[model samples]
Target: MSETNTIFKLEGVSVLSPLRKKLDLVFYLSNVDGSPVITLLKGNDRELSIYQLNKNIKMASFLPVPEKPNLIYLFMTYTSCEDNKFSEPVVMTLNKENTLNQFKKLGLLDSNVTDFEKCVEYIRKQAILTGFKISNPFVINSFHLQCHRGTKEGTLYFLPDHIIFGFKKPILLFDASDIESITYSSITRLTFNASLVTKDGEKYEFSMIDQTEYAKIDDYVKRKQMKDKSMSE
Candidate 1:
């Protein structure tokens, strides 16, 4: 039976990496039974294809296309392998169960499997419904879920609160006042970014956290700018 399911599509993004590759469009597969994330890395070579990734995964085609602001259900599946072997990733829609059966051609229904077993199971067969926007912002200084290449324009990424930051070409900017309350998700891995546009743009353009010992936020501002420069170069 095709198990209609909801799954999150993590758009592969690009990065100014030190490696030979510049762009990486990948997906993060979260096991419903646990918190461990599996990254199905693809496109380190920069090749283009209709499907996001090419492997034991298949891209389900859009069945019922809709007009703007109407209803649309887009689907994709995976069922091929690198070793000439075959495996499938189970991501079915609520109405369509045939896909699951098709995916079953892989190994989604291992009745004798355990929760941990499902983590590395041949197929991730669980209900991961389409999730709404979840705002998770972090302090700067440490690494962040950043955008690299193709995602550099015309998209809004969520932050800690309901605050939404817009991107102008390549930079992520926000007004401190835009946020009512802020929580630093990464307390230890603190990362700070200088905002080019704030009330006191230049002055407050640093970490949300204020360390008293530091002379000015500018010090952090300088270091962060330098660190990124080193990485990019």
Candidate 2:
């Protein structure tokens, strides 16, 4: 008797995701105990524990589809190790017109993304159907980022309640309310460096960012701090 029943499976390549390798998507139901299983086929059947799977996934709607317009992007998350602690989520492209037929092979015929809100919705729904939960705090603003500590680079998403850094290592987050200040200095006409100060006296530094990005972040920081100061008074 077949001990495992396949629920969804697909093979493709991650065009814009963090991992640029070809992908094998397989989600199935284990006949042994009737539990769900999701895995990425990369020369091995790398499995994800439900605890590790739920916290890391996210989806972005209406992401570009290269030269095409009928397609969009669908972001997903994964773990770097068996421990299940994952960082940044990856993205997958899907066709909007052929939403049903496109993702059918991946066992996601019901999943469709047209806007960011809808994108977040699909992820939540998928989690419920597959038996998992995730944390997807909304981002209020975003900045192109570069870390001063190790030259790490990614996008920094500013959430009203929290902050998420989409770095290569994984997802880095901090409590937004605990942030005390953000300071910046001019490095060059086109580049700048900045630091983030927290209430606990912890500091995070970022360097090698364009002036445009710095200006955007700077304005946002100032506004938030001013509001906080007034509220405290």
Candidate 3:
């Protein structure tokens, strides 16, 4: 409700959710109470949601739309904890060609780098602040691989400090400290299955990973000092 000058504004952004209702909304970055904030407003200005730029944001990343080169998907996780339950992160489709630079000017993203490089830096800082450990200091970004979990298909991101499977409902994230081991099974010439066992013995299995990424994944596990159970009896 406070009055402030808009640092940046983008209209007609599409919000993606599980209901498959792509809501066209407006986004504004402004200073509120001397702190940066992001506001999401309904198309008709009937509803409003405000998030603190640095405090409320837990994670943020941007992905390019392959077919539509000018389009970018800006994914963010905002803190909305209620008791023990937490709200899901939201993804907004930014249609502007200068989406990255626009956000950078608002102090929401990094400047002076390729869009992809800046996104990696942004996500890494957020992840570390979210209490995730960074095992590999040299890792610049993540390896995003498409895979299946149960009957659903999603992208799995192999990061330096964590592994995340998401952009879907029930996002899964495993920190380095939480992982007990990683195992490989169902290996074939073309595909394989990878499973992660938590320190408490909970198991999460992902399947049909391209075999070509086996070495890269294996190196990641070793670098993180996570136990490799693929060769165990």
- Give the top-scoring candidate (TM-score): 3
Q: Give the TM-scores of the predictions, in the order they appear.
A: 0.21, 0.57, 0.67
What RMSD does each model have against the real structure?
16.7, 6.1, 6.5
lDDT of 2 by residue, 1-233 (tens): 12246654545534344455556555565566655555555645553322234343333222343345555544445544346343455555544554444454344544553343443455557557765653444335443344444466665655554565643555556666677988776588778877889998988876776776766676777777777888887
* Per-residue C-alpha lDDT of model 1 across residues 37-149, encoded as one tens digit per residue: 22223434323222213233333222221222222123333443333232322221221233333234345445444332232122222222222111113214321223222
The local distance difference test score of each candidate is 0.29, 0.54, 0.61
21: Cα error in model 1, Å? 11
Record all residue pairs in model 2 with backbone atoms less than 3 Å apart, i.e. clashing: 87-170, 87-171, 88-170, 88-171
lDDT of 3 by residue, 119-193 (tens): 445545544543332122323246767888988888777766667785677777677657778899998889999
Q: After superposition, how far is residue 6 of candidate 3 from its true place, in Å?
A: 1.5
- Those runs of model 2 whose alpha carbons end farther than 4 Å from true positions after fitting are 1-10, 13-21, 27-37, 47-101, 105-121, 128-152, 222-233
Better model by TM-score: candidate 1 vs candidate 3: 3
Give model 3's TM-score versus the native structure.
0.67
The list of candidate 1 runs beyond 4 A from truth reads 1-35, 38-40, 43-169, 173-233
